[PDB]
Amino acid sequence: MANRTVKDAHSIHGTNPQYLVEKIIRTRIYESKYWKEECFGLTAELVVDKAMELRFVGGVYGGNIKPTPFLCLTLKMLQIQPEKDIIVEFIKNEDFKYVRMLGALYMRLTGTAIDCYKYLEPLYNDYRKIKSQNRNGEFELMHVDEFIDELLHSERVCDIILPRLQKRYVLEEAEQLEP
């Protein structure tokens, strides 16, 4: 496999971080023009360059499950496992909505329960419109805060089954979050 997770990488949710994405979707990503041309040899520090070019959020689309750039870059991030501050920088970035959303999804996929609430909840204040490519290929609009709500409460976002997230009440009782 030429697209293995980097050797220094540690497991996430008890597995290879890339495994959070369905195998058949990974295969489609690895054979895509965007992965081959835009993602090759991407390093943690260079992801932001490609993220700033994103134009919508999305997973896969169409009958034969074509991957969106957003999803391709998510998988590349899972493969290279950027340092936490890169992800936080993305989430905090005021310049680029889609960089924020990419960081938010990645944090939801890989962060501790505490970090999910801590870093994603402030984005409920972001009412800005974002474009989304629907599973059927059509473009739709939603708000940033709605995407965050899906990250914190839905089972699947951008065609990725989200890992188990402990309920906020439990963290509060363990002195891990402010109630």
- Alpha-carbon span 166 to 104, nearest angstrom: 17
Q: Name the experimental technique.
A: X-ray
Which of 110, 117, 109, 102 has its CA nearest to residue 149? 117
Query: 129-133 and 57-58: which strand pairing?
Result: parallel
- Alpha-carbon span 154 to 177, nearest angstrom: 21
Helix locations, 81-167, DSSP H: 84-92, 97-110, 113-120, 144-153
Residue 16 structure tokens? 């290879």
- Alpha-carbon span 96 to 164, nearest angstrom: 28
DSSP structure class, residue 175: T
The answer to whether 78 and 20 are in contact (CB under 8 A) is yes
**Experimental structure resolution, Å:** 1.3
Give residues with Cβ within 8 angstroms of 115, minimum separation 6: 84, 107
Can you tell me which residue has the tokens 């709500």? 149
The answer to whether 60 and 74 are in contact (CB under 8 A) is no
- Alpha-carbon span 71 to 20, nearest angstrom: 12
The answer to whether 158 and 171 are in contact (CB under 8 A) is no
Task: Give how far the C-alpha of residue 164 lies from the chain's centroid of Cα atoms, to the nearest Å.
Answer: 15
- Alpha-carbon span 73 to 23, nearest angstrom: 16
**Other C-beta atoms lying within 10 Å of the C-beta of residue 71:** 28
The 3-state DSSP composition of the chain as helix, strand, coil percent (nearest 5) reads 50, 10, 35
- Alpha-carbon span 50 to 73, nearest angstrom: 8
- Alpha-carbon span 119 to 168, nearest angstrom: 13
DSSP structure class, residue 94: S
Q: Which three-class secondary structure state does DSSP give residue 75?
A: helix
Which of 48, 84, 50 has its CA nearest to residue 68? 50
Which of 105, 121, 110 has its CA nearest to residue 71? 105
DSSP structure class, residue 123: G
Report the run of H or E that residue 73 belongs to, with start and end: helix 69-80
Sort 125 into a burial class: Cβ within 10 Å, 0-12 / 13-18 / 19+: exposed
- Alpha-carbon span 50 to 93, nearest angstrom: 14
Which of 157, 140, 160, 161 has its CA nearest to residue 149? 157
At 5, which amino acid appears?
Answer: T
Give residues with Cβ within 8 angstroms of 109, minimum separation 6: 12, 17, 20, 74, 78, 160, 162, 163
